[model samples]
Target chain A: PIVQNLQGQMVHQAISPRTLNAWVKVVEEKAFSPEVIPMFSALSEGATPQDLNTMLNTVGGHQAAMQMLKETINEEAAEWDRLHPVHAGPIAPGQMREPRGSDIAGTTSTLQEQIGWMTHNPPIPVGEIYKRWIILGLNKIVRMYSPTSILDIRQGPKEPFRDYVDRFYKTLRAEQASQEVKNAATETLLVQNANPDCKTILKALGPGATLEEMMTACQ
Target chain B: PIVQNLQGQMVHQAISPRTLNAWVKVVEEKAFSPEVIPMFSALSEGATPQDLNTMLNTVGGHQAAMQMLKETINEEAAEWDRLHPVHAGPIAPGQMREPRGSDIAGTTSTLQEQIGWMTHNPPIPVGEIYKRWIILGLNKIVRMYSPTSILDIRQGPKEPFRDYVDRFYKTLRAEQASQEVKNAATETLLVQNANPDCKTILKALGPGATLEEMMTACQ
Candidate 1:
């Protein structure tokens, strides 16, 4: 009961940093392929569930859905194909092949299992399919963090200064550059972007102080 | 190039509150047929992408993958089935039917399209099918928030006080109850959960002060 209650409480809470981190991994890995990030970003921005469904239904159709999945799996089986040149030909009428390496035969097995499941029960929910990829996120994507992108950081017109500082702190963390480089960048950006009071506070903290110290002082 | 750059920047950023809000909507809605929130929560907690993919493939297979999606869509067809009684019979040899209301015909059409896609290209990536459901989130799951859950609030062992307070603030927002109720809940929870220093500060701020004011002061 306690677990269920906590679970219930958690569902309503804002997306945790943990989820955000996982999504970042998904995006960078292109775990669901290249086009997923935009759709995810739109959802994050309040695009309704119906809007996402429509996008998938439309854009997905053009890409050749089943084909996409098949091709991807086929590509994964490439190593196996090289080893068994003769097996490329279609299953000779009723004949079938024995199981092989996980890299090759394993995929077919996954497909077979899926088909077997589909046979007794068809019309697989779109969610069941997507669930694989959402879970794939549990597995790993690859947009990288660049130090230069910090230049783009600007406080939103309505955003609180504290929020802006927090955003800046996260940006610094995402940057691949060294902490020393980030420190310099923080000073440069904070002076350029933060308000008068914040700027004054940072001046008091002066050089050699950590970004976090500046953040705490400014706040 | 510019669009691509912005997209790249976005992927690395922390999960937007917008996405957070959408997730809230999905949880409140139960759009993915339940058992999803825990997986999502785990992912948020830094569970690997592979972990998610595995969970879905396993747990989902047990529930009957094709069956689940089919049953859900089949349920949608109820309204149409009521209107046409005879079509339920398996299509006889060399027999077919014309299109009908979107309620019934539309689902079959969707199924047909999927099957058609699968015919030429099989082994649909778990993602493609899931993309539909994810977009369904873009489209609707339901676990509701309760005002009373606020009593369970406690700062995490390693969580920053600021972060804990922010979590509390978000919890208050998620509650379905009115602001007045949340205001009281916020005070009660904050007092109980926050450290002694935070407690002292709140007492100094006194009663009748707003939650936000308390948050700002505690920070």
Candidate 2:
């Protein structure tokens, strides 16, 4: 490498020699983004080999800039928690655990466990329920990965409506499903549609309908 | 009042004749909310009568503020719109021209028309289609004022469900009702109840079921 040590423990400059000029052009266009905005600002002036040498003189500039965004996000998330006093189900915080299933042999392998492994991102924080970024980001991870959440069987953009139904039924294993699950799922679907006074006839179909038929009806 | 006027417009003192001292304490405690966070920051400096007097001398303060927040809400609302692809209704955008009503004289009248007047917030933009705040506010106005909205009547927190059926039917003034409406409404119900496989038997109860009877099955 054209640089320094470890074991001997050496490090590289923040922006490095090559990418500094490229990022300077980017920030001049306001393209650095919230993530790199700070480092880009700090590096904007003093364009030289010496500038790259010092950008991360204390520590890497990207690391320092990201730490700022993370701290700010966490602060805002904490404020959000302070304002929102409630969450679903519990006499205690963290009492309600997220779901994952395992087989009799005792290894996590639900369709969900498989999905979670597929779309993992490291910066995504866990266990902070009221954080907005977490909710926004985690919803992406969940919708992309988890089969269903909070009565919403949100499907992928191209996932067939019919296949979603098949998966939902396969997941439920049919027969007398949990009443609570049913109540919430239906409400979520109806409310999202936000339609006219059309619920009248739907009620007559009873609590039961063929999954394929329902797939069509809901769609 | 210690004030001056020009043309039809008049000027009020920076803090005006009163409420300054009261708001002094309020802002000190950060109580003037949802509206005054900006002013609070400016006024936090001098905390004196002259300070506020000078605060407005240069800037028209409160009026400037209301406009800022209004514009911010509008701007954010607009950005929200550009991102959302679709909106309610089939041909897309602005279907039901608005609230119902009229007498033999062809004037608007109904349970809804009377209430529309109560909640209207003008200077508020109309028919921007996909704005969140606009829709939330308009929905509030329209429902207090449209005969029905989808899920909202779609049930009340606690209303007699059968009466809802009567309202849905009478509002639409349908005769015998179409099979599509029946299937959709019932499917919506079952989907919402999202109950177990137990509901299939209810579907077997058949399409000939009474409107009130259907409502009961859904509940």
Candidate 3:
């Protein structure tokens, strides 16, 4: 009954794409009727036959008509499309087979099973779970490596960069944590401890300087 | 564009009763699942085999389930019917066509010709139009009649009551106009004058009057 109710809502809402397409077909049929053709034909009249020939021969007049026609067609098409915008994507034939009473029970059982699976499997690779954070930062840098740019290398040993960055961050955080246990470190102490390891990693990576020094040099 | 808009509205607002029927099928499918059957079976368990036989034979074990099922089905069906009832009646395939612009113009021309013919050659018996008016009254009554009661009329004409009532009203209205003026009147005046005649003809037919009384007494 809920399915039926949902279907009623769907039908009432005009949410089906097939229905919209069918409507477009109907409108297209109507537009081609004698009532409309004369209107288009009348606009094409009044020019001498030679002038009309010239207009067609020249790109400007033909282009103008084509542009006008394109605009008109687009407006009309958009108007129709808005009214009956597609609903559900294509339903394969027989995809709409009536759901039996058993199917509802089966659906309930399936949901229950999915919950059970989630409880049992748990997830693996903790870093993979947090990959989104790394990807965000990488995205900012990689965007500069467009087809014409060379400063940010592409197509060369990408996986090593990911592995190196992941390990470097993890080790630095561990070292920072151990130092915090020894005493309360000032921001300067923390910055100094972080700066040397960061500089060593950057130099090893062929930049040969801390990011701060690299920025000063580039400027 | 107006026609396209109207068609889109039709597609949107027009509830296809077929879709509701599809939903009913889904509900029926779910309600009859194996799990549901077992639940019902468990409810009637523990009875002696003899008691079960008697129950199955006469009492009908918890006819409540069947009753509930029937009620649920009927309620859902009625809701669907309310939302998307079967077409007021079956429309014959291809009985109607899109009213083309040319077709509309032709219809207007035909109507003008008919008016001219009526002016030139009026009906022989003025009362015949009155009889048609009475028939139209009957048709109106039939249309207002409840769906359940519509089929109760036995041994009468096989024609649709709707059509019959329409013709009856049309004839009655035309006759009343003919009586109002000795000579043929303008189409507009005839329609206007026929309004009172239609009301009077219907009132004469009375509320509880049978179809027979409607035809005879109104005439």
Q: Quote the positional error of residue A136 for candidate 1 in Å.
A: 34
- DockQ each candidate and list the results: 0.02, 0.01, 0.01
- The alpha-carbon RMSD over the true interface for every model, in angstroms, is 20.4, 23.3, 33.6
lDDT of 1 by residue, B104-171 (tens): 22333444333233222232222233333332232122213222376676776555455565456444
After superposition on all C-alphas, the RMSD of every candidate to the true structure, in Å, is 22.7, 27.8, 34.5
DockQ of candidate 2, scored on C-alphas against the true complex (2 decimals) = 0.01
Once fitted onto the true fold, the runs of candidate 3 whose alpha carbons sit more than 4 angstroms away are A1-159, A164-199, A203-219, B1-9, B12-71, B76-219
Fnat of model 3, as a fraction: 0.00
Which docking class does model 1 fall in? incorrect
- Residue lDDT tens for model 3, A47-87: 22222122222211111122223233333334434654445
lDDT of 3: 0.28
Candidate 2's error at B116, in angstroms? 64
TM-score, each model? 0.26, 0.15, 0.14
Candidate order by decreasing TM-score = 1, 2, 3
